[PDB]
Design an enzyme around this catalytic site. Structure first.
Site, PDB file in Angstrom:
ATOM      1  N   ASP A 254       3.188   8.213 -12.691  1.00  0.00           N
ATOM      2  CA  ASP A 254       3.961   7.224 -12.352  1.00  0.00           C
ATOM      3  C   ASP A 254       3.676   5.930 -12.976  1.00  0.00           C
ATOM      4  O   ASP A 254       2.569   5.754 -13.803  1.00  0.00           O
ATOM      5  CB  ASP A 254       4.531   6.972 -10.821  1.00  0.00           C
ATOM      6  CG  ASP A 254       5.698   6.527 -10.270  1.00  0.00           C
ATOM      7  OD1 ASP A 254       6.519   6.288 -11.387  1.00  0.00           O
ATOM      8  OD2 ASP A 254       5.800   6.406  -9.238  1.00  0.00           O
TER       9      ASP A 254
HETATM   10  P1  LIG Z   1       6.835   2.065 -11.167  1.00  0.00           P
HETATM   11  O1  LIG Z   1       7.608   1.551 -12.187  1.00  0.00           O
HETATM   12  O2  LIG Z   1       7.243   3.011 -10.386  1.00  0.00           O
HETATM   13  O3  LIG Z   1       6.571   0.720 -10.034  1.00  0.00           O
HETATM   14  C1  LIG Z   1       6.267  -0.684 -10.823  1.00  0.00           C
HETATM   15  C2  LIG Z   1       6.936  -1.491  -9.673  1.00  0.00           C
HETATM   16  C3  LIG Z   1       5.800  -1.589  -8.276  1.00  0.00           C
HETATM   17  C4  LIG Z   1       6.772  -2.767 -10.220  1.00  0.00           C
HETATM   18  C5  LIG Z   1       8.250  -1.425  -9.222  1.00  0.00           C
HETATM   19  O4  LIG Z   1       9.232  -0.692 -10.410  1.00  0.00           O
HETATM   20  C6  LIG Z   1       8.949  -2.504  -8.663  1.00  0.00           C
HETATM   21  O5  LIG Z   1       9.829  -2.968  -9.301  1.00  0.00           O
HETATM   22  N1  LIG Z   1       8.806  -2.784  -7.206  1.00  0.00           N
HETATM   23  C7  LIG Z   1       9.173  -3.907  -6.775  1.00  0.00           C
HETATM   24  C8  LIG Z   1       8.349  -5.226  -7.169  1.00  0.00           C
HETATM   25  C9  LIG Z   1       6.880  -5.400  -6.502  1.00  0.00           C
HETATM   26  O6  LIG Z   1       6.285  -4.499  -6.607  1.00  0.00           O
HETATM   27  N2  LIG Z   1       6.586  -6.438  -5.888  1.00  0.00           N
HETATM   28  C10 LIG Z   1       5.600  -6.936  -5.217  1.00  0.00           C
HETATM   29  C11 LIG Z   1       4.628  -7.211  -6.387  1.00  0.00           C
HETATM   30  S1  LIG Z   1       3.117  -8.030  -5.944  1.00  0.00           S
HETATM   31  C12 LIG Z   1       2.417  -7.027  -4.609  1.00  0.00           C
HETATM   32  O7  LIG Z   1       2.552  -5.782  -4.382  1.00  0.00           O
HETATM   33  C13 LIG Z   1       0.975  -7.602  -4.176  1.00  0.00           C
HETATM   34  C14 LIG Z   1       0.062  -6.529  -3.256  1.00  0.00           C
HETATM   35  C15 LIG Z   1      -1.013  -7.109  -2.496  1.00  0.00           C
HETATM   36  C16 LIG Z   1      -1.924  -7.529  -3.716  1.00  0.00           C
HETATM   37  C17 LIG Z   1      -3.402  -7.533  -3.287  1.00  0.00           C
HETATM   38  C18 LIG Z   1      -3.969  -6.178  -3.150  1.00  0.00           C
HETATM   39  C19 LIG Z   1      -5.344  -6.006  -2.835  1.00  0.00           C
HETATM   40  C20 LIG Z   1      -5.874  -6.860  -1.651  1.00  0.00           C
HETATM   41  C21 LIG Z   1      -7.054  -6.326  -1.012  1.00  0.00           C
HETATM   42  C22 LIG Z   1      -8.235  -5.722  -2.035  1.00  0.00           C
HETATM   43  C23 LIG Z   1      -9.267  -5.173  -0.972  1.00  0.00           C
HETATM   44  C24 LIG Z   1     -10.175  -6.233  -0.382  1.00  0.00           C
HETATM   45  C25 LIG Z   1     -10.768  -7.258  -1.135  1.00  0.00           C
END
Ligand SMILES: *P(=O)(O)OCC(C)(C)[C@H](O)C(=O)NCCC(=O)NCCSC(=O)CCCCCCCCCCCCC
Ligand SMILES: CCCCCCCCCCCCCCCCCC(=O)OC[C@H](COP(=O)(O)OCCN)OC(=O)CCCCCCCCCCCCCCCCC
Ligand SMILES: CCCCCCCCCCCCCCCCCC(=O)OC[C@H](COP(=O)(O)OCCN)OC(=O)CCCCCCCCCCCCCCCCC
Ligand SMILES: CCCCCCCCCCCCCCCCCC(=O)OC[C@H](COP(=O)(O)OCCN)OC(=O)CCCCCCCCCCCCCCCCC
Ligand code: SF4
Ligand code: SF4
Lengths: 242, 122, 186, 185, 80, 60, 237
Positions: E37
């Site tokens: 993916d």
């Molecule tokens: P692929 O094309 O299948 O997927 C790509 C994405 C995911 C971009 C999709 O196509 C998509 O368009 N999805 C919607 C957009 C999206 O994902 N929005 C949110 C993005 S920001 C996000 O998800 C932030 C998440 C949390 C960030 C922190 C993570 C780690 C924190 C804790 C770590 C461990 C302790 C320190």
């Protein structure tokens, strides 16, 4: 004890009796009518000079407030920073107020000071959970930490800001405490775990639950409607009869 | 990064091609950093568990189809990244993101109806 | 100099040979030592101040029994409302004037329908459309309300009786003189 | 940075003086450098303090001054009869800034309106005195006692049996402070 | 060039999100062939990145969609 | 009554910078003093080391 | 003695130092402001407000004239005419040259008016100044070097720069006479906005606002109406 010998006992001096005390009754709003006409005039001039963004203006006593479109933030504050009749070169304060009954939850309130004209102005705009506002740290270096507070405490996001991070809350804190849906004691509490040798984070329990005495608000309205105090220079002329 | 080591000026995604580019760069930095997060915060987990758990936190917002919602979710990530890569978060905040270091553990909702009934809603 | 004599300073004094010794070996003889006087300071305690001597006052208008209806002195319920003017309102104010100064006489009928002509144009078009279409002539008129210049904002003092900036001037006598980089302002 | 209107009369500084325009003799200027005269003056001021009386109080034998209005630990008082003054209005519970008071009342055996519970969390209280301004019967007061550090904070959960015991203990001093301050209240 | 395949090839062998081993060819596409993916790509390239002790930039990592592209980037980097 | 000021008002207190120059710390009297101390000492030293040298002639 | 204000002497306001030429700076800023206002339509109250105020201050600034101004300007007119190529922004850049150790002037036109912007080499102590202040680009590349490396090392600057002492084809621009210290005070009592140097700070702020006021087109109709119940609070009745 060696008394000063030319400094007598100030309590031993007898005081001239005060009889009937009389004080006139004053309405403190009345002192502000002499400036009511120009505060309206200045707000009227402002919204003719920037018709693209200034939706309305209000005047309460000595305070003139300007209501602007969120996209007008940079132009409006530029005009109020660099105009020779609007020499408002301090940000005193930027904060937000939450109105969950509005589609745009957040009202963004800016308070500005003009040392040149000994004048104050308030600028209000609006924001949302997802709708961002221009940052004004391009115009006022002092506004930087204020926007961090509004962001940290409300979730409002300031496009253009360098280093928009939390300023007040703890590091992994989740939530925006000044939102009205956020509870007073929060959702989590901390303690030291002996078995884990660190401080751990737990769901909130309170030995005494907080007693909210809001229900004791008077069944009767206690302030009333108030009094209209607009200058006649900003009222519509009335049609004389005949 | 003018004022701080991992500072990023708040930017508004121009379109979905741009917004997906930023998400992937955010995910890349986080899973790159997992070895560095596991030594500083002395996380008693494999780097693989950290990376698979980082993936879950992006997997939660995979179905967001609003561009204004992605930018706030990206800004939240960037700020979380900055406070973790600078040693600003305490080990207590970091290893409290793993929801198995509760003395009740990961199993904190009742599994089904009957087990939560016999325990009084968990 | 700026000093006043020690003898008026309500501190314990040195006596006799020790006074002569102090007034010899000391930077400023008029300086006190900060030690308060027992027979004068906090004497008697507030606990021995006679309860019956003190009087809780009333002022005649508000505290009288016989010539004050409360509703003349209820200024909390005569509070000013905020006066709001939107873009529609200012279009009408420029269009037909103000109750202080009208543009047209508005006598009897055929003036009421002119009064909505001000209100109707306001909702339909902002102050920007209004100024565009009636030309730069009435761009000069917006300044003609304040005498052809833009208005300056109101100051917040009224020590002169009118709202104004405070006139910050150098005080007649400087506290450091010219000897230190700090000027005193009145 | 200056107010509107004409600039203040002589707001602008004079032009700076060159080193040889200064009015300070080389003898005075060089002597003050090498002899360190201004530092000598300050050392002399410390000799002046050395021979002045100290400000110190020997505590716990000598105490500092406290006014009749002092806000110390709470007490529940009685009447001359011996009945508790408290009638369970709960006004002190409503006005508490920190929600430190918990009151449960009912009808006493004789039909009188009296409290069954009266708890004050001494670790929630801010010692504002609001509870005693709101009383209609002078029932809750704050004694001048500030010396009651305890070992456990369970000892700081005052229940109605401790607050009445405090009033019995402190009544002469409570009545005296009320007598002084009542005209002003 | 034979080694840069051998170390990569065994790496994807242990990668779970690969649909099935033995589909790895010299020109295998991450999405079409292996069924990996958009976020499985980053995970793979990171393993690609770390195993050879080099940091892939974003401007270059977005280009790594097929194995052959991954090969031609690692050869261009002098260190390994 | 209330707590009111005395009928004629309180007298003025001292509030301006007093800080009065003393001769003990002015440079001219101190420069003169340090100089006379070093001159007296240099006369006393020049007499002593002469006598010390003469005591050494007798010792030798 | 105190007939003229020392340039860069402290004003009383920290960080604000006495302007070397206050009157011409203010004139330059006003006229420049009036020129950028023609990008704005006539019916905008902003332009009318800025125009009227700017012209009002421009009139009082021009009300005072430095002594010897008429005499100086006649020579300066000729001095420009016969040596125009010396002060041409298209020839010598916006800066008047690159030899920062030499005098640099340029003729600039704003709103039907002519200004010379002369940048003067900084006065430094002789005990600290190396090579009369000639900027050190580094040593020349020496040894076996390529054609491309010599170009990026600046070799073609040999045929462009000049010796600072080489003043034969050039003429020295003489500065404008200044106001007196009393004249400056009278300027201040007319304009009524504090110190002259502080007026230039405001005046160069009005110049910068026009660029933002045109880019945003503040005279255009309202962008975003208040949706219903946007500025409604808690008022009774
Ligand atoms: P692929 O094309 O299948 O997927 C790509 C994405 C995911 C971009 C999709 O196509 C998509 O368009 N999805 C919607 C957009 C999206 O994902 N929005 C949110 C993005 S920001 C996000 O998800 C932030 C998440 C949390 C960030 C922190 C993570 C780690 C924190 C804790 C770590 C461990 C302790 C320190
Ligand atoms: C009992 C009295 C003595 C008790 C201890 C006093 C300690 C004093 C220490 C002071 C040190 C001050 C200092 O760091 O330098 C101050 C200064 C020398 O530094 P300079 O850069 O010349 O500063 C000029 C303006 N002060 O000026 C000096 O300090 C120089 C003065 C000369 C020192 C004595 C030399 C013999 C006379
Ligand atoms: C110590 C306290 C005793 C001395 C001061 C006592 C006194 O009151 O003396 C009088 C006078 C004080 O100063 P004055 O301002 O003249 O007083 C006016 C009073 N109507 O006294 C004077 O004017 C003279 C004060 C003494 C001045 C000379 C002191 C010389 C001391 C020896 C040399 C030391 C120099 C070296 C210091 C080195 C420091 C690093
Ligand atoms: C400068 C420092 C001077 C220190 C004082 C020197 C001095 O007093 O010298 C005295 C000296 C005579 O030696 P003495 O031991 O004092 O007496 C012997 C018996 N008549 O006789 C001499 O050596 C004469 C000294 C004359 C010069 C004095 C200093 C002149 C320069 C200042
Ligand atoms: S102590 Fe006073 S205020 Fe509190 S419940 Fe009793 S009567 Fe009411
Ligand atoms: S003094 Fe303590 S108990 Fe009394 S009202 Fe204040 S916080 Fe509550």
């Amino acid at each position: 004890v060696a008394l000063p010998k030319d400094a007598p006992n100030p309590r031993a001096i007898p005081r001239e009796p005060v009889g009937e005390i009389k004080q006139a009754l004053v309405n403190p709003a009345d002192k502000y009518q002499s400036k009511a006409d120009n505060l309206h005039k200045y707000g009227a001039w402002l919204m003719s000079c920037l018709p693209k963004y200034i939706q309305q203006f209000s005047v309460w006593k000595d305070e003139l407030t300007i209501y602007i479109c969120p996209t007008g933030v940079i132009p409006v504050f530029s005009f109020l920073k660099y105009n020779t009749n609007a020499e408002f070169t301090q940000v005193s304060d930027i904060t937000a107020v939450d109105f969950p009954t509005r589609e745009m939850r957040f009202e963004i309130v800016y308070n500005l000071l003009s040392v040149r004209h000994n004048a104050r102005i308030r600028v209000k705009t609006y924001a949302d959970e997802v709708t961002p506002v221009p940052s004004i740290t391009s115009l006022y270096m002092g506004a930087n930490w204020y926007e961090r507070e509004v962001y940290d405490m409300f979730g409002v996001l300031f496009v253009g800001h360098p280093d928009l991070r939390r300023i007040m809350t703890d590091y992994g804190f989740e939530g925006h405490p000044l939102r009205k849906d956020f509870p007073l004691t929060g959702y989590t509490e901390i303690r030291y775990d002996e078995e884990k040798k660190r401080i751990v984070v737990e769901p909130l329990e309170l030995t005494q639950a907080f007693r909210n005495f809001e229900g004791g608000s008077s069944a009767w309205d206690q302030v009333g409607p108030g009094i209209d105090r607009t200058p006649d220079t900003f009222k519509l002329p009335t049609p004389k009869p005949e | 990064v003018q004022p701080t080591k991992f500072a990023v000026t708040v930017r508004q995604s121009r379109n979905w091609a741009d917004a997906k580019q930023r998400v992937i760069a955010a995910y890349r930095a986080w899973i790159r950093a997992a070895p560095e997060i596991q030594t500083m915060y002395s996380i008693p987990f494999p780097v693989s568990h950290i990376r698979t758990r980082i993936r879950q936190e992006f997997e939660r917002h995979r179905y967001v189809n609003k561009l204004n919602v992605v930018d706030v979710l990206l800004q939240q990530s960037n700020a979380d990244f900055q406070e973790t890569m600078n040693f600003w978060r305490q080990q207590s905040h970091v290893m409290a993101f793993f929801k198995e270091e509760h003395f009740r553990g990961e199993k904190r909702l009742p599994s089904n109806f009957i087990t939560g009934f016999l325990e009084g809603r968990n | 100099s700026n000093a006043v004599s020690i003898t008026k300073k309500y501190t314990v004094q040195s006596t006799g040979i020790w006074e002569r010794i102090r007034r010899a070996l000391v930077i400023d003889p008029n300086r006190s030592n900060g030690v308060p006087l027992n027979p004068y300071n906090r004497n008697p305690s507030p606990g021995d101040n006679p309860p019956l001597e003190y009087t809780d006052p009333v002022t005649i208008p508000a505290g009288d029994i016989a010539d004050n209806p409360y509703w003349k002195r209820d200024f909390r319920r005569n509070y000013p409302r905020p006066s709001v003017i939107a873009q529609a309102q200012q279009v009408a104010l420029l269009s037909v004037g103000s109750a202080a100064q009208p543009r047209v006489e508005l006598i009897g009928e055929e003036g009421t329908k002119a009064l909505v002509a001000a209100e109707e144009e306001g909702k339909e078009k902002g102050v920007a459309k209004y100024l565009e279409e009636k030309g730069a002539e009435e761009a000069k008129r917006v300044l003609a309300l304040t005498g052809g210049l833009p208005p300056t904002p109101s100051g917040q003092t009224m020590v002169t009786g009118q709202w104004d900036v405070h006139k910050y001037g150098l005080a007649e006598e400087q506290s450091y003189g010219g000897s230190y980089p700090c000027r005193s302002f009145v | 940075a200056t107010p509107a209107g004409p600039p203040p009369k002589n707001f602008r500084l004079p032009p700076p003086k060159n080193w040889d325009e200064e009015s300070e003799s080389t003898i005075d200027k060089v002597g003050k450098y090498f002899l360190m005269t201004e530092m000598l003056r300050g050392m002399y001021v410390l000799l002046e303090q050395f021979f002045r009386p100290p400000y110190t109080i020997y505590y716990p034998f000598e105490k500092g001054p406290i006014s009749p209005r002092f806000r110390g630990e709470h007490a529940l008082r009685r009447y001359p009869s011996g009945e508790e003054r408290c009638i369970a209005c709960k006004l002190c519970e409503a006005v508490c800034p920190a929600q430190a008071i918990t009151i449960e009342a009912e009808e006493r055996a004789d039909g009188s309106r009296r409290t069954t519970r009266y708890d004050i969390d001494m670790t929630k209280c801010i010692y504002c005195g609001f509870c005693q301004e709101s009383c209609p019967v002078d029932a809750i007061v704050e004694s001048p006692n500030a010396e009651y550090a305890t070992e456990t904070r369970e000892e700081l959960l005052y229940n109605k049996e401790k607050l009445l015991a405090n009033g019995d203990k402190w009544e002469p001093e409570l009545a005296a402070a009320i007598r002084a301050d009542a005209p002003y209240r | 060039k034979v080694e840069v395949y051998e170390r990569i090839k065994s790496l994807l062998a242990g990668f779970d999100k690969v649909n099935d081993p033995n589909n790895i060819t010299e020109t295998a596409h991450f999405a079409n062939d292996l069924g990996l993916d958009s976020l499985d790509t980053v995970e793979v390239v990171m393993a690609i990145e770390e195993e050879f002790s080099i940091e892939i930039p974003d401007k270059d990592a977005d280009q790594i969609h097929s194995v052959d592209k991954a090969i031609e980037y690692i050869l261009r980097q002098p260190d390994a | 009554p209330q707590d009111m000021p005395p009928p004629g008002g309180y007298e003025a207190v001292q509030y301006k910078r007093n800080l009065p120059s003393r001769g003990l710390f002015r440079p001219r009297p101190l420069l003169a003093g340090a100089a006379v101390l070093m001159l007296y000492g240099w006369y006393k030293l020049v007499k002593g080391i002469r006598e010390q040298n003469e005591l050494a002639r007798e010792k030798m | 003695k105190g007939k003229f204000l020392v340039p860069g002497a402290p004003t009383g306001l920290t960080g604000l130092g006495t302007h070397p030429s206050p009157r011409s700076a203010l004139l330059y800023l006003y006229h420049s402001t009036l020129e950028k206002l023609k990008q704005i339509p006539e019916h905008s109250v902003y332009r009318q407000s800025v125009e009227a105020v700017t012209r009002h201050r421009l009139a009082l600034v021009e009300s005072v004239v430095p002594e010897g101004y008429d005499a100086w300007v006649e020579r300066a007119k000729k001095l420009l005419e016969e040596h125009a190529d010396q002060f041409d922004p298209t020839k010598v850049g916006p800066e008047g040259g690159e030899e920062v150790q030499g005098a640099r002037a340029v003729k600039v036109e704003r709103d039907g008016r002519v200004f010379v912007v002369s940048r003067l080499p900084k006065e430094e102590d002789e005990r600290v100044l190396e090579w009369d202040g000639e900027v050190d680009e580094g040593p020349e590349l020496e040894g076996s070097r390529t054609l491309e490396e010599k170009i990026e090392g600046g070799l073609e600057k040999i045929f462009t720069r000049r010796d600072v002492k080489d003043t034969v084809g050039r003429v020295e621009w003489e500065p404008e006479p200044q106001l007196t210290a009393e004249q400056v005070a009278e300027l201040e009592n007319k304009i009524g906005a504090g110190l002259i140097e502080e007026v230039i700070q405001v005046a160069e702020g009005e110049l910068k606002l026009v660029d933002t006021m045109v880019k945003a087109r503040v005279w255009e109709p309202l962008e975003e109406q208040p949706r219903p119940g946007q500025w409604e609070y808690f008022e009774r009745k």
